[PDB]
Write a protein that binds this ligand. Structure first.
Ligand SMILES: C[C@H](CCC(=O)NCCC[N+](C)(C)C[C@H](O)CS(=O)(=O)O)[C@H]1CC[C@H]2[C@@H]3[C@H](O)C[C@@H]4C[C@H](O)CC[C@]4(C)[C@H]3C[C@H](O)[C@]12C
Ligand SMILES: [Mg+2]
Lengths: 552, 1316, 66
RNA sequence: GAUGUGUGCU
DNA sequence: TCTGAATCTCTTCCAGCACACATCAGGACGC
DNA sequence: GCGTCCTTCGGAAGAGATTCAGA
C-alpha cells in the first residue's frame, strides 16, 4: 500500500521473499562460475536459513528482524496464533450493517423493545430505505435515493419508520460469555445517540449503565429475521440455559420497590379498616387515607387451575397489607395469593416469576415481568428510599469484642514465643480468632440494625423489623450483603494479598468512622488484589471456556 | 496573614494537625533531571559533560593523532515553543561543542604536535524542555515518564520451590551492570556452582575461577579453611579446633591429654565444647579410617623422584595415606567440609569441572559465548578481558558500585566501574554463605533495590550511544586521514547523534504523548513512575508480586493510584512529598525526634534507611511542644507496625498526605472510601474535561491551589506590584520599587494564551482573575487556566444531588439530570479540533486548492472564498466544504459527519517554491501587521513604564514639575539634576531605552523574516491548510458523568425542571442519583461530601440572605467569623478583625455561592463538625430533608438525602462513540469490512459471539454474518441488490478469507484442496 | 483432557484452528487426512450453515441426498 | 497494515 | 548390563470488544 | 536531495530426548 509520499509500506512476506530470491540467485550464479567449495557451501547454508525464516520464522535459533529488533512474521506466523487467519478472520469476522453506542436505561420499554437512535437506524437500515424509496417512486435511480437519504428529508423518516416496524435487531455486549449476551429486540426509534436497553435484560447482559457500549446488528434475510424473532428474541429468553431459574429477574430497584410496598409496620393512617378489594386499597393509598404498610383485611378473588385447565374462583377475606393488595392487581389469574402476602425480596419474586412460568406459560410471564418492573419503579420512586450517614448505626459493643480478641492474640503470642506453636500455626490461629471476632461484631451490628424499631401498637411499645434504609436494601437483596453492609457499620476485617495469603493484621474500623494512614495502606493490599485478579486472571478463565467450547 | 489571592475567597479548613513542611514543587523531578542533563558541570559528574569525557579524547589506532573535547555550548532555539507548536518542528537547541584535533610529531609519542586546531562543530540537536516539563517533538507535546528499574549491583534471588519438582530451594546471584553483561551464578540440585553469562548456558563457576588465573590450591584456599594432619611417631594425630565440633556425631571416642571427654556415638553439645575450651587443648587422637572421608587441598609430590602422588581436590583413602606415609610429607592439609554449615560445594564443582587450566577455561568460555568458530588463544583472552574487565564494554555506575559494596557489607562505597577478581570471589562467597544458612536473600520489589531513571538520565544514555557510533566512525576514518586538511568537522557526523536522540524522544515506550485535558492530568502524567520501557519488565513477564503494593511504598509511591487493565501496579504514581536520592532511590521527609521532642528538622530517608529506625505516624497527638500526649504511640519499625513507647521513637511522618499521590489527595473524605473506589475516583478526576465556566469545589482538600499553581496553566506573577492594565488577552504589572532592579527595570507583561487546542482536542484558554489597579504580590495567580477558579483546581460543577430512586431513570448507575443544568450551560464544554488538507503533487500533475469544484453546486461553495478556503467564523456543519481541493482527474476537505462547529483559525503552510495563494497572502499580511503591532505595543508599554521610572528618579534632586509636562518626553533624561550617582542612573536608563529600541527593531526584522520564511515540509506535499473547528458539546443523554469517589454514571434523561423533586421552598433538585450504588461499593465518602456540601451551601445561603437586603458590615463580619471559628481544634485560626471592612465585602460576595471547605485527606472533618456546621445554618443535622414529587405534587414518604455534590464530566462523550455502518469500505488482503470509527468500519462479530449464535441454533443468521456482510464478495453485492430490490434473500458463496487461508497453506510445502 | 480430546479429533481443521496449528497441519499433511466437514467450527470456517439448529434439517437433507 | 503508548466496560 | 523411572530440555499457551494519539516503511554512499 | 542495494528477565503443563539405576 503506498503511503504519503514516494515510499512504500513495510511488508514482511515481501522482505522474506526478497531474501530468499537474493540467496537463490547468488547460489545459482556461484554454481555456474565454479566457486570454491567453502563459499558455495556457506551460500547453500544461507539459502537454507532464508527458506527456514520464510516458512516458519523463529523456530530456528534466532528469528531475523526487519527494523528496530522485531521479528517479521513468516508464512506460519500469519496462519497460527491469536492474530492469524484462523482465529482473527475465519472464526470471527467484522460485519456490515452493524453499529456501536453507549446504553441508557429507558425504563418505559417492554421486554421485546429497545431504543435505536434516530440517526443510527438511518445508517443501518440504509439499503432498506433505498428499496422503499425506489418502490414508492420518490427516486428513479440509486444515486437519487442515496442523495435523498444523505440530505435527511422529511419523507426519509417515515420510510425509516415503515422499514423498522417489525425488523428486530441484535444487541450484543462486548464479552459475550453465555448465549444471553446476544438478544433480539424490536427497535423503537428515539432521538439521541444512546441505545436504551430494557432494565430486565441487564442481568442477562451483565450490563450496567456506567459507560459501557453495545453493538447493534441487523438481520437481513427473512430466515435471519425469523431466527431473531423466534429464537434470539428477548421475550423467548426468560430462562437461563445453565439452570432453569429465570434470568429476567428484577434487580436492585424493582426489588426495593416491591419490598417497600409489600411490607408492614404496626401502625398506619388506617389499620383496623376492612376493605372490599384491591381497587379499594389502591384508592385509599392514592387518596392518602391509608399507609402502604397497614395491616387490613381485603376481599380478594384468587383463581386456581387445579382442574384440567379451568380457573375456579375462590373469594375469601385474608389478613394482608395495603401494599400487597395493590400488588395483587398485577398478578395474573391462576396464581395463589400466598406469593405476595409476605415481604418480597429478590428470591421471593424470582420464585414468583418461576412459578408463573411453570403454571401459566410464557406470555403471562412476560406481561407479569413488565408489570412487576413498572410497579416496582413507581413505588420505589414514591418512597424516597434514600441513604444517609445516620443510617449506618454503629453497635455500642464492637470495641469490647475487639479487646477480647486482642487479649486472645496477646496470649497466642506469649504461647508462640515460649514454644507452644511454630510460626506456621500462629498465623492460622490468629486468622481464626480474628475471623471469629469479625463474625461476632457482624452479628452484633446486624442484631442492632434489623430489629431496632421500637414503635407503639397504638398502645405501648412494640418490636418490628426495621425500616432502616441500609437494612432495607440489604435484606431485600437489592444491592448488598452481610459483608458489604458489615464493612460500613461493623468492622472491615482482614485483607487478602494478590498471592492469596491472608493478611496477619486485621482492620478494626469501618467506612463510617475514618481509616488510619496505615489501615488504608493495609486495605490497599486487598484492594489491588481484587483489581489485579480480574485483569490478570480472567485470561485463564476465558481460556477454560475457549477450550471447553472447542472440545464440545 | 493571607495574600490577596487568599484574602478574596479563603477556604475554610478542618485540618486538626498543623503542617510543618509545605507541599514542594510537584513537577520537580523533570525540571531537576533535565537541568542536570542540560547544564554545564565543571567537574563532569553528570550531563553532557559526563558524556563527552566518557568518550573523548578519541585517538586513532596508535596513529599518532588524537581528537579531544574542550567545551560545549547550546545556542538559542530557532523557534520558541508557541511557534514550534504552530509549525510542527521540534523545540530544540543546536549543540555547538568545541572540538580540537591534534596530531603529534613523528618519532614522538609524548612530544610536540604538528599543529593544534580547534572549532565548534555542530553535532546533533537536543530537544529542550519547556517550563512545565513537556517536550515539543513534532508540534505535539510529549512527556518523558520516569522509569522504575532494578538498581545495578548484585542481587541474591531465590528461585524458591517449583524448580526440580522436589521442593529443594535453589540459590542464584545476579550481577546486573548499568551497561555490560550479566554474571549469573546459580546452584544445582546436586549442590554445584554454575556460572551463566548472559543467560546462555550453564558451566561450572570454577571455569571462571581458572579464567581469573587461579590454581586449584588457591581456589580451595579461598573457599575453605584447612585442617591439619601431622606425621608423628604413630597414630597420625590431627589438629583440633573445638568450634568445629559444633553439631555433629562423634565417630569414635574423643580424648585429649589422656582422659576421654566424649564417648563414641555421643552428641557434642555446647557443654562439651566449652569444657574443651576450658581444657585449653589443641591435639587429639584420630583413627586412620577417619581420614578416608577427607579431601586434600594442596598437591603432594615425591621428595625422592619428584613424581606427583596426589593432585588437588581428590579423595583420600588408606592406600593413599600409606603412599603418603612412605614419602615423607609430615604435614597433611584437608578441607573442613561440614555436612550442614561448611558444605563442599566448590569441591563438587571442581570435580564436575572438565577444564584444567587458564587456557582451556578461556577456550570453553569462548566456545560458550561464540559457537561455530574454532577458538584461538588470543581471541579468547581478548573476549574474556572485554567481558567484565574493560571500561568500554562493561560499566557498573556509581550507584551500581554503591549497591555492590553495600550488599557485600564492605566499607568504601566508591570504586572502579569494572569488576575485579575480589568482587567475583566475594559474590560467590556470599552466595555460598546464603546456601549455608548465614545471610538471607533480598526481595526485588523493595524500593531500596529499585532506582528512578528520569528524563535526564535516559536522554544522556542515548546521547552516549550516539557518541559511541560517532567515535567508531572516527576510529574507522582517523587512520585514513589526509593530514593538514582535516578540520574538526569532516570526521564528525551529526546524523548518528540526531538520529539516536530523535529515536528516543519521538518513538519510545516512555516518550508518551501527553494526556492533557485538565491540569490534574498533566501534573499526574509528569509525576508518573513507569516500570515498563527499555531496561524494564514486559507486561507478560510480570509476576503478581511486582503488581502488589510493597510495605516500602509508604511515602514514596501512591498505593491507590494505578491504572486498571493490562498494567496495574507497573505504572505507580509518585507521592506528594516523595523525592529522588542523589543516586536515584526514593525518599520521604520525616520530622526528626529527639529524646522526647518532635523537632522541625526534616530528614529525607531512603527506603533502606527507613527499616532501621522506628517511625511514628502523622495522626499522633502532640501538645504545643513536640511531646506525644500518650505513653504508647502507634509506629512502624521494620515493615511491621506495632505500639511503641514515646521514648523509642526517633522520627515522625510530616503529614497525613504523604502516602497518597497528588491525584488521590484531591478526593475529600478519602479515609471513608473503599480503595478500589479511591482508584476509580482518582482516574476519573484525571479524565475530567474543563467546562464552560469554572466552578470551585465546595468540599475540597486544600491541595487544589497547589495543583492549580504548580501545573503551569495559570499565569502566576513573577514580581509583585500593581495591575497597571488588565485586558482579556494580556496583563501588565507595575512592579514595586522594592523588587525593581536598578537597570533594565521596566515592567513585565503577561501574554495570556487564548482559545487553543490541547492534545485531547479540549480548549485550554486563560482568562484574568485580577482587576484594574489591584495590588498583587509575588507568586499569586493572575489568570485562571482551563478548569481553574481563582487559582484553585476546579474540574467540575457543584451539583445539588438527591439520593433516591426516580421511576427507574437511575436504575443501575444512570444519572437523572434536570433541564436547568443544560439551560445554564454548566456542563457545556468547548472542543477545539483541527482538520488538515495536505495537497500532494502526485502523478499526472500536481493538485490545486481552487474554489471551483466539479459536479457540486454553489450551495456548498458559498462559504468558500475566491481562494478556496473557508472564512474564519463560518458556522460550518457536518458535510460542508472547508478547503476545496481537486486532484488531477474532487477530494476537498469536508467537516466530518455529525459535528457542527465554527472556524476559528486557518493556517496555510506553503513549500518554498510554490509562489502563494491570495488567502495565504492575506493571512501573511495580517500576521505581519499583528506581529509588528504586538512588538510596538510592548515597547510602548515598558517604555511608558521606563519614562515613569525616569520621572520617579527625577523628583529627587531639584525637580521642576511645571516644566516637565510641557517638555516633550524625548528630553526627560538629562534634565535638572546634579552629577551624583542619580545622574549615572539616568544615563543607564537612557542607554537601556536605546538598547530596547534597537532590540525591538532587530526582533521586528527577525519576525518579518520568520513569517516570510519557507517552512519546509514532508517530501512530496505542496501546501498544508489546517482549519480549526470549535464545537460546544452540550450535555445530552449518553455521556459519562462521575464524582470524585469512583461513582460513574451515564445520563439517561434530561428531565424538565417542573418534574424534578423540590423541597418546601420550591427549589428543584438538579441531579437525582441512586441510593443503592452507595452500599454495594463502599464509597461512603460521597454521602459525607454531600452532607458537607449541603452545610457549605447553607452557609452560603445565609450569607446571600444577609447580603441581598443590604445590611451593615458588622453582621456579615460576625456571621463569617462564626463560620470560620467552627470546629473542634482547627489549624485555620483566621481573624476577620484585620480585614479593612472592604476586603471582607469581597469575601462575602465570593462566599454567597457557598463557602468553600477544605477537608484534608486523612485529617478531614468529623460527623460532629458536619452536624455543627449544619446547625450553623437552618438545615437538619441528619442531612436529610423533605422532598415533594415534581409532577404528582405529593411528598416522598421518607426523608431523602439532599446536598451539593461535586459532579464531574468525563470526556467519554456519547457523540464521540456512536457509530453505524452499512455497506462501505472493505479491507485489502481479506475482503472484510474495516475496523474503527475514524475509518468507516463495522463492529467485529468475534469468535466468542459466534458460539452465542451456535447455542441458539441460529444457522441462517450466522451464515449471513460470516458470508453475506463479510468476506464473501459476489454474494455481498447480490445481497445488496436484493435488499434494494424488495427481496430479502441471500445467495452465499465462500468467504474470501478461506481462499486466503488455502493459498497461504499452499505457499508452504503443504497441498490443501477441496474434494468433489 | 479437554485440550487433548480437542487436538486429537478426526477433523484436522478444528484441531488446527484450536491450538498448535503447525503441529496439527504437519501431521495432517504427512498422514494425508481428509476432512469431512462434520462439526460446527468446520462449517463456520468454510462458510456454510452449522449442522446445529435451523441448518440441521438442511444438513440432514444434504447427507441423505448422496 | 503493523507496531508503541494511553484509555473505557466487563 | 538391558529397561522402566527419573530427569533434562524444548514447546506452546496465557479472555473479549472498542477509542485516541504518533511512527514506519533501507539509510549509506555515490552522484 | 535522487537512487541501487544487502539480548538476557514469567510460569504451569506436556511431550520427547537423554540418563540413571538396579536386578
Ligand atoms: C557522583 C554522583 C553522586 C554525587 C556524590 C553519582 C552518583 C549516581 C551517578 C549517576 C547514576 O549512576 C546514574 C547514571 C549512570 C550513568 O552511567 C552516568 C550518569 C548517571 C546519572 C550517574 C552520574 C553521577 O556519577 C552520579 C549522579
Ligand atoms: Mg459496566
Amino acid at each position: 500500500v503506498p503511503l504519503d509520499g514516494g515510499r512504500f509500506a513495510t511488508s514482511d512476506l515481501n522482505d522474506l521473499y526478497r531474501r530468499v530470491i537474493n540467496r537463490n540467485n547468488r547460489l545459482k550464479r556461484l554454481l555456474d562460475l565454479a566457486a570454491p567449495d567453502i563459499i558455495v557451501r556457506n551460500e547453500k547454508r544461507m539459502l537454507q536459513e532464508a527458506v527456514d525464516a520464510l516458512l516458519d520464522n523463529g523456530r530456528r535459533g534466532r528469528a531475523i528482524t526487519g527494523s528496530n529488533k522485531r521479528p517479521l512474521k513468516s508464512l506460519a506466523d500469519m496462519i497460527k496464533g491469536k492474530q492469524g487467519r484462523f482465529r482473527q478472520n475465519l472464526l470471527g469476522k467484522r460485519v456490515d450493517y452493524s453499529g456501536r453506542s453507549v446504553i441508557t436505561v429507558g425504563p418505559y420499554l417492554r421486554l421485546h423493545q429497545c431504543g435505536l437512535p434516530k440517526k443510527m437506524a438511518l445508517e443501518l437500515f440504509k439499503p432498506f430505505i433505498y428499496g422503499k424509496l425506489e418502490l414508492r417512486g420518490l427516486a428513479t435511480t440509486i444515486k437519487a435515493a442515496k442523495k435523498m437519504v444523505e440530505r435527511e428529508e422529511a419523507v426519509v423518516w417515515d420510510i425509516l419508520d415503515e422499514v423498522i416496524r417489525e425488523h428486530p435487531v441484535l444487541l450484543n455486549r462486548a464479552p459475550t460469555l453465555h448465549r444471553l449476551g446476544i438478544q433480539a429486540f424490536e427497535p423503537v426509534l428515539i432521538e439521541g445517540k444512546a441505545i436504551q436497553l430494557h432494565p430486565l435484560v441487564c442481568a442477562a447482559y451483565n450490563a450496567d449503565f456506567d459507560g459501557d457500549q453495545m453493538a447493534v446488528h441487523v438481520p437481513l434475510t427473512l430466515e435471519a429475521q425469523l431466527e431473531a424473532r423466534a429464537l434470539m428474541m428477548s421475550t423467548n429468553n426468560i430462562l437461563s440455559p445453565a439452570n432453569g431459574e429465570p434470568i429476567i429477574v428484577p434487580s436492585q430497584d424493582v426489588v426495593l420497590g416491591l419490598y417497600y410496598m409489600t411490607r408492614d409496620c404496626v401502625n398506619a393512617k388506617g389499620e383496623g379498616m376492612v376493605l372490599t378489594g384491591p381497587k379499594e386499597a389502591e384508592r385509599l393509598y392514592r387518596s392518602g387515607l391509608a399507609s402502604l404498610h397497614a395491616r387490613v383485611k381485603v376481599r380478594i378473588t384468587e383463581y386456581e387451575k387445579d382442574a384440567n385447565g379451568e380457573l375456579v374462583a375462590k373469594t375469601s377475606l385474608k389478613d394482608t397489607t395495603v401494599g400487597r393488595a395493590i400488588l395483587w392487581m398485577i398478578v395474573p389469574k391462576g396464581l395463589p395469593y400466598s406469593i405476595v402476602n409476605q415481604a418480597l425480596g429478590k428470591k421471593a419474586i424470582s420464585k414468583m416469576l418461576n412459578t408463573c412460568y411453570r403454571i401459566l406459560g410464557l406470555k403471562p410471564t412476560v406481561i407479569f415481568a413488565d408489570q412487576i418492573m413498572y410497579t416496582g419503579f413507581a413505588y420505589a420512586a414514591r418512597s424516597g428510599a434514600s441513604v444517609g450517614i445516620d443510617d449506618m448505626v454503629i453497635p455500642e459493643k464492637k470495641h469490647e469484642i475487639i479487646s477480647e480478641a486482642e487479649a486472645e492474640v496477646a496470649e497466642i503470642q506469649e504461647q508462640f514465643q515460649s514454644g507452644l506453636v511454630t510460626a506456621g500455626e500462629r498465623y492460622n490461629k490468629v486468622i481464626d480468632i480474628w475471623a471469629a471476632a469479625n463474625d461476632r461484631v457482624s452479628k452484633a451490628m446486624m442484631d442492632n440494625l434489623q430489629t431496632e424499631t421500637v414503635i407503639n401498637r397504638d398502645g405501648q411499645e412494640e418490636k418490628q423489623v426495621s425500616f432502616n434504609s441500609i437494612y432495607m436494601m440489604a435484606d431485600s437483596g437489592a444491592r448488598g450483603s452481610a459483608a458489604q453492609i458489615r464493612q460500613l457499620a461493623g468492622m472491615r476485617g482482614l485483607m487478602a494479598k494478590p498471592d492469596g495469603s491472608i493478611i496477619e493484621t486485621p482492620i478494626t474500623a469501618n467506612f463510617r468512622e475514618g481509616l488510619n494512614v496505615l489501615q488504608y495502606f493495609i486495605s490497599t493490599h486487598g484492594a489491588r488484589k481484587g483489581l489485579a485478579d480480574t485483569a490478570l486472571k480472567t485470561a485463564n478463565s476465558g481460556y477454560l471456556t475457549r477450550r471447553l467450547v472447542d472440545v464440545a | 496573614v493571607y495574600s490577596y489571592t487568599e484574602k478574596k475567597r479563603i477556604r475554610k479548613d478542618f485540618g486538626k494537625r498543623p503542617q510543618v513542611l509545605d507541599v514542594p514543587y510537584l513537577l520537580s523531578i523533570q525540571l531537576d533531571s533535565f537541568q542536570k542533563f542540560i547544564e554545564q558541570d565543571p567537574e563532569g559528574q553528570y550531563g553532557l559533560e559526563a558524556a563527552f569525557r566518557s568518550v573523548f579524547p578519541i585517538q586513532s589506532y596508535s596513529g599518532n593523532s588524537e581528537l579531544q573535547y574542550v567545551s560545549y555550548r547550546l545556542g538559542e532555539p530557532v523557534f520558541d515553543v508557541q511557534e514550534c507548536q504552530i509549525r510542527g518542528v521540534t523545540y530544540s537547541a543546536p549543540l555547538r561543542v568545541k572540538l580540537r584535533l591534534v596530531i603529534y610529531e613523528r618519532e614522538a609519542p609524548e612530544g610536540t604536535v604538528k599543529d593544534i586546531k580547534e572549532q565548534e562543530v555542530y553535532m546533533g540537536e537536543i530537544p529542550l524542555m519547556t517550563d512545565n516539563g513537556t517536550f515539543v517533538i513534532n508540534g505535539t507535546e510529549r512527556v518523558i515518564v520516569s522509569q522504575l528499574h532494578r538498581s545495578p549491583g548484585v542481587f541474591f534471588d531465590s528461585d524458591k520451590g517449583k524448580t526440580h519438582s522436589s521442593g529443594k530451594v535453589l540459590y542464584n546471584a545476579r550481577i546486573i551492570p548499568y551497561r555490560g553483561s550479566w554474571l549469573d551464578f546459580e546452584f544445582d540440585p546436586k549442590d554445584n556452582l554454575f556460572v551463566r553469562i548472559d543467560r546462555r548456558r550453564k558451566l561450572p563457576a570454577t571455569i571462571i575461577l581458572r579464567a581469573l588465573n587461579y590454581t586449584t590450591e588457591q581456589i580451595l584456599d579461598l573457599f575453605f579453611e584447612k585442617v591439619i594432619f601431622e606425621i608423628r611417631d604413630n597414630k597420625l594425630q590431627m589438629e583440633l579446633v573445638p568450634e568445629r565440633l559444633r553439631g555433629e556425631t562423634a565417630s569414635f571416642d574423643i580424648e585429649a591429654n589422656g582422659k576421654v571427654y566424649v564417648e563414641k556415638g555421643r552428641r557434642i553439645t555446647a557443654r562439651h565444647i566449652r569444657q574443651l575450651e576450658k581444657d585449653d587443648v589443641k591435639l587429639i587422637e584420630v583413627p586412620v579410617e577417619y581420614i578416608a572421608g577427607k579431601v586434600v587441598a594442596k598437591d603432594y609430590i615425591d621428595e625422592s623422584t619428584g613424581e606427583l602422588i596426589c593432585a588437588a581436590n581428590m579423595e583420600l583413602s588408606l592406600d593413599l595415606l600409606a603412599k603418603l606415609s612412605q614419602s615423607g610429607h609430615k604435614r597433611i592439609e584437608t578441607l573442613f567440609t561440614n555436612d550442614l554449615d561448611h558444605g563442599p560445594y566448590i569441591s563438587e564443582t571442581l570435580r564436575v569441572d572438565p577444564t584444567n587450566d587458564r587456557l582451556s577455561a578461556l577456550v570453553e568460555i569462548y566456545r560458550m559465548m561464540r559457537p561455530g568458530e574454532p577458538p584461538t588463544r588470543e581471541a579468547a583472552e581478548s573476549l574474556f578481558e572485554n567481558l567484565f574487565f574493560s571500561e568500554d564494554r562493561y560499566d557498573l555506575s556509581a550507584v551500581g558500585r554503591m549497591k555492590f559494596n553495600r550488599s557485600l557489607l564492605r566499607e568504601e562505597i566508591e570504586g572502579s566501574g569494572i569488576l575485579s577478581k575480589d568482587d567475583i570471589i566475594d559474590v560467590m562467597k556470599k552466595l555460598i554463605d546464603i546456601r549455608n544458612g548465614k545471610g538471607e536473600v533480598d526481595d526485588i520489589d523493595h524500593l531500596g533495590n529499585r532506582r528512578i531513571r528520569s528524563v535526564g538520565e535516559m536522554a544522556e544514555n542515548q546521547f552516549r550511544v550516539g557518541l559511541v557510533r560517532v567515535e567508531r566512525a572516527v576510529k574507522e576514518r582517523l587512520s585514513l586521514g589526509d593530514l593538514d586538511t582535516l578540520m574538526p568537522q569532516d570526521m564528525i557526523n551529526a546524523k548518528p547523534i540526531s538520529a539516536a536522540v530523535k529515536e528516543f524522544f519521538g518513538s519510545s515506550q516512555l516518550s508518551q504523548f501527553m494526556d492533557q485535558n485538565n491540569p490534574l492530568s498533566e501534573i499526574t502524567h509528569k509525576r508518573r513512575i513507569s516500570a515498563l520501557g527499555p531496561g524494564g519488565l514486559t507486561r507478560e513477564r510480570a509476576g503478581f508480586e511486582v503488581r502488589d503494593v510493597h510495605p516500602t511504598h509508604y511515602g514514596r509511591v501512591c498505593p491507590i493510584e494505578t491504572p486498571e487493565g493490562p498494567n496495574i501496579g507497573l505504572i505507580n504514581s509518585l507521592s506528594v512529598y516523595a523525592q529522588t536520592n542523589e543516586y536515584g532511590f526514593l525518599e520521604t521527609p520525616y520530622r526528626k525526634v529527639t529524646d522526647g521532642v518532635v523537632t522541625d528538622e526534616i530528614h529525607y530517608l531512603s527506603a533502606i534507611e527507613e527499616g532501621n529506625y522506628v517511625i511514628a505516624q502523622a495522626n499522633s497527638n502532640l501538645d504545643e511542644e513536640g511531646h506525644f500526649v500518650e505513653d504508647l504511640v502507634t509506629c512502624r519499625s521494620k515493615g511491621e507496625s506495632s505500639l511503641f513507647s514515646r521514648d523509642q521513637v526517633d522520627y515522625m511522618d510530616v503529614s497525613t498526605q504523604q502516602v497518597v499521590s497528588v491525584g488521590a489527595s484531591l478526593i475529600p473524605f478519602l479515609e471513608h472510601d473503599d480503595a478500589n473506589r479511591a482508584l476509580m475516583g482518582a482516574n476519573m478526576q484525571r479524565q475530567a474535561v474543563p467546562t464552560l465556566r469554572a466552578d470551585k469545589p465546595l468540599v475540597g482538600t486544600g491541595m487544589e491551589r497547589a495543583v492549580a499553581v504548580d501545573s503551569g496553566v495559570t499565569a502566576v506573577a513573577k514580581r509583585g506590584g500593581v495591575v497597571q492594565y488588565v485586558d482579556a488577552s494580556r496583563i501588565v504589572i507595575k512592579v514595586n520599587e522594592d523588587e525593581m532592579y536598578p537597570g533594565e527595570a521596566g515592567i513585565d507583561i503577561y501574554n495570556l494564551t487564548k482559545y487553543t487546542r490541547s492534545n485531547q482536542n479540549t480548549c485550554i484558554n486563560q482568562m484574568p482573575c485580577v482587576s484594574l489597579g489591584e495590588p498583587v504580590e509575588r507568586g499569586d495567580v493572575l489568570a485562571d487556566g482551563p478548569s481553574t477558579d481563582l487559582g484553585e483546581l476546579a474540574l467540575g460543577q457543584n451539583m445539588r444531588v438527591a439520593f433516591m430512586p426516580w421511576n427507574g431513570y437511575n436504575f443501575e448507575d444512570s444519572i437523572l439530570v434536570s433541564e436547568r443544568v443544560v439551560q445554564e450551560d454548566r456542563f457545556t464544554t468547548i472542543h477545539i479540533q483541527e482538520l488538515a488538507c495536505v495537497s500532494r503533487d502526485t502523478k499526472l500533475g500536481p493538485e490545486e486548492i481552487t474554489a471551483d469544484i466539479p459536479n457540486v453546486g454553489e450551495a456548498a461553495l458559498s462559504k468558500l472564498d475566491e481562494s478556496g478556503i473557508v472564512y474564519i467564523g463560518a458556522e460550518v456543519t457536518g458535510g460542508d466544504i472547508l478547503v476545496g481541493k481537486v486532484t488531477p482527474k474532487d477530494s476537498s476537505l469536508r467537516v466530518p459527519n455529525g459535528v457542527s462547529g465554527t472556524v476559528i483559525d486557518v493556517q496555510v503552510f506553503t513549500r518554498d517554491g510554490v509562489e502563494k495563494d491570495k488567502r495565504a497572502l492575506e493571512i501573511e499580511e495580517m500576521q505581519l501587521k499583528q506581529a509588528k503591532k504586538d512588538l510596538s505595543e510592548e515597547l510602548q508599554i515598558l517604555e511608558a513604564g521606563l519614562f515613569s521610572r525616569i520621572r520617579a528618579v527625577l523628583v529627587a534632586g531639584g525637580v521642576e514639575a511645571e516644566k516637565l509636562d510641557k517638555l516633550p518626553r524625548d528630553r526627560w533624561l538629562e534634565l535638572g539634576l546634579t552629577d551624583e550617582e542619580k545622574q549615572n542612573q539616568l544615563e543607564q536608563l537612557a542607554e537601556q531605552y536605546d538598547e530596547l529600541k534597537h532590540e525591538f527593531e532587530k526582533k521586528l526584522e527577525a519576525k518579518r523574516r520568520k513569517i516570510t520564511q519557507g517552512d519546509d515540509l514532508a517530501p512530496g506535499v505542496l501546501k498544508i491548510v489546517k482549519v480549526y473547528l470549535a464545537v460546544k458539546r452540550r450535555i445530552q443523554p449518553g455521556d459519562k458523568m462521575a464524582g470524585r469517589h469512583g461513582n460513574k454514571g451515564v445520563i439517561s434523561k434530561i428531565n424538565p425542571i417542573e418534574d424534578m423533586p423540590y423541597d418546601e421552598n420550591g427549589t428543584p433538585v438538579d441531579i437525582v442519583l441512586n441510593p443503592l450504588g452507595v452500599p454495594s461499593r463502599m464509597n461512603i465518602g460521597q454521602i459525607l461530601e454531600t452532607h458537607l456540601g449541603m452545610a457549605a451551601k447553607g452557609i452560603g445561603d445565609k450569607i446571600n440572605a444577609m447580603l441581598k437586603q443590604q445590611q451593615e458590615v458588622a453582621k456579615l463580619r460576625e456571621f463569617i467569623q462564626r463560620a470560620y471559628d467552627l470546629g473542634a481544634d482547627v489549624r485555620q485560626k483566621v481573624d476577620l478583625s484585620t480585614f479593612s471592612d472592604e476586603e471582607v465585602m469581597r469575601l462575602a460576595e465570593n462566599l454567597r455561592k457557598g463557602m468553600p471547605i477544605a477537608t484534608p485527606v486523612f485529617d478531614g472533618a468529623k460527623e460532629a463538625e458536619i452536624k455543627e456546621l449544619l446547625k450553623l445554618g437552618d438545615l437538619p443535622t441528619s442531612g436529610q430533608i423533605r422532598l415533594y414529587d415534581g409532577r404528582t405534587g405529593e411528598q416522598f414518604e421518607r426523608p431523602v438525602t439532599v446536598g451539593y455534590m461535586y459532579m464531574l464530566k468525563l470526556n467519554h462523550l456519547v457523540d464521540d462513540k456512536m457509530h453505524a455502518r452499512s455497506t462501505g469500505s472493505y479491507s485489502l488482503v481479506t475482503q472484510q469490512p474495516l475496523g474503527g470509527k475514524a475509518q468507516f468500519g463495522g463492529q467485529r462479530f468475534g469468535e466468542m459471539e459466534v458460539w452465542a449464535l451456535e447455542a441458539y441454533g441460529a444457522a441462517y443468521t450466522l451464515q449471513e454474518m460470516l458470508t453475506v456482510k463479510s468476506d464473501d464478495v459476489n454474494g455481498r453485492t447480490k445481497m445488496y441488490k436484493n435488499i434494494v430490490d424488495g427481496n430479502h434473500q441471500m445467495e452465499p458463496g465462500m468467504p474470501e478469507s478461506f481462499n486466503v487461508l488455502l493459498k497461504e497453506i499452499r505457499s508452504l510445502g503443504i497441498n490443501i484442496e477441496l474434494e468433489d | 483432557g479437554i485440550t487433548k480430546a480437542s487436538l486429537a479429533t478426526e477433523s484436522f481443521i478444528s484441531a488446527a484452528s484450536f491450538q498448535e496449528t503447525t503441529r496439527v497441519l504437519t501431521e495432517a499433511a504427512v498422514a494425508g487426512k481428509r476432512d469431512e466437514l462434520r462439526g460446527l467450527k468446520e462449517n463456520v470456517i468454510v462458510g456454510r450453515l452449522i449442522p446445529a439448529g435451523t441448518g440441521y434439517a438442511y444438513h440432514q437433507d444434504r447427507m441423505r441426498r448422496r
